[PDB]
């Protein structure tokens, strides 16, 4: 099954020149295990 | 040109190129952000800062990341709170838990946050989430109130393949989730 | 499977993905390890740890690094001590300076060193260097006495391009430096 | 053209930890020189 979402987000405006990237998960009164099984990343700044 | 790339196909016991925060750890080939335990937070960051834009030149990076993740709740209705992929300042620490997913602190715009996150939110928080009350994908910039959402139906325990890409020429962030 | 890759074609004034030790800094788009000044050391490390082998499987990584570097000396005769690309523990700190190149402390094998380096050595140290006295490229494992060396004629102020490659299938470490023209 | 080449069999896992940091080092003594790097690329792959 597939889900797609698209938005113009001008990153220069909101984030610093240097960033760290990652994953976050939380539980509350109700809960679930949240796991990542593989991760690929690539960026290119001209 | 500055480029940074990596891939981790299976997470090992001492995944030293990752920084862990909260309860985040690696167990059995997997990065587990959260255990099926109440009221916790876990985050994991790539070790290197990545140069996402440059003030001299005004250039912004093109990037793509893909990951497959699993959410495993005790049943399909009692599920909370969600999971994020995020881009924050280099010294980012966990923010508010629960409904704020460990990445934000309010529904009002906070320029000081400097965090953009793509959320996979499994709990309807009446104060800021879609009125339909459905589970959803959202794009968040400096707030837990998404700028745009898509309803998503959680498949409990199944692996979901996600791709997020940013094109600097048009500034469109695209997120695609597929349960194969 | 784990891969780590990066490229920096122009270094900027706040290269946040490098760790600088000693005098290392970035200037006019270049990574400057030492200025032409006496008795100093400069080091720079990529900030992420890299998984080079695995004890559970016994597999070792394949890798390639390439870089262009410049040695710029006051004249062709008075040049010391040299330059290294090295592979060390994650917590590596500068070791002895001078002919030890900031990376080793002895001419004898030192198992606690755990570093291999490829040196571009511009100063003949009678104690361990190839007796012919020539400048040379060497492969160093846990010692400043190279297991293997090749004479190299330094072209002062000119760009050298090097490729270091490790093939996990043969355990061959290959080093190539080329001067244009 | 000029090219200098060196090959050696070095069983890396006998000498380095599983996890490593890579980098550059340069020193001067009584005689000296500037040691600069203009570009750097690195790629590794652990099966
Ligand atoms: Ca929510
Ligand atoms: Ca020497
Ligand atoms: Mn939401
Ligand atoms: Mn030597």
Swiss-Prot record, chain A:
Tetramer of two alpha and two beta chains. Pfam families: Lectin_legB (PF00139). One of its GO terms (molecular function) is D-mannose binding. It comes from Lathyrus ochrus (Cyprus-vetch). InterPro entries: ConA-like_dom_sf, Lectin_LegA_CS, Legume_lectin_dom. This is Mannose/glucose-specific lectin alpha 1 chain. Belongs to the leguminous lectin family. Keywords: Lectin, Mannose-binding. It comes from the Eukaryota.
UniProtKB/Swiss-Prot annotation, chain B:
Mn(2+) binds at residues 119, 121, 129, 136. InterPro entries: ConA-like_dom_sf, Lectin_legB_Mn/Ca_BS, Legume_lectin_dom, Leguminous_Lectin. Pfam families: Lectin_legB. It comes from the Eukaryota. Transmembrane segments: none annotated. Ca(2+) binds at residues 121, 123, 125, 129. Keywords: Calcium, Lectin, Manganese, Mannose-binding, Metal-binding. GO terms for molecular function: D-mannose binding; metal ion binding. Tetramer of two alpha and two beta chains. Belongs to the leguminous lectin family. Binds one manganese (or another transition metal) ion and one calcium ion. The metal ions are essential for the saccharide-binding and cell-agglutinating activities. PANTHER family: CONCANAVALIN A-LIKE LECTIN FAMILY PROTEIN (PTHR32401), LECTIN (PTHR32401:SF45). This is Lectin beta-1 and beta-2 chains.
UniProtKB/Swiss-Prot annotation, chain D:
The keyword Transcription does not apply. InterPro entries: ConA-like_dom_sf, Lectin_LegA_CS, Legume_lectin_dom. It holds the Pfam family Lectin_legB. GO terms for molecular function: D-mannose binding. Keywords: Lectin, Mannose-binding. Belongs to the leguminous lectin family. Tetramer of two alpha and two beta chains. This is Mannose/glucose-specific lectin alpha 1 chain. It comes from Lathyrus ochrus (Cyprus-vetch). The lineage of its organism: Eukaryota, Viridiplantae, Streptophyta, Embryophyta, Tracheophyta.
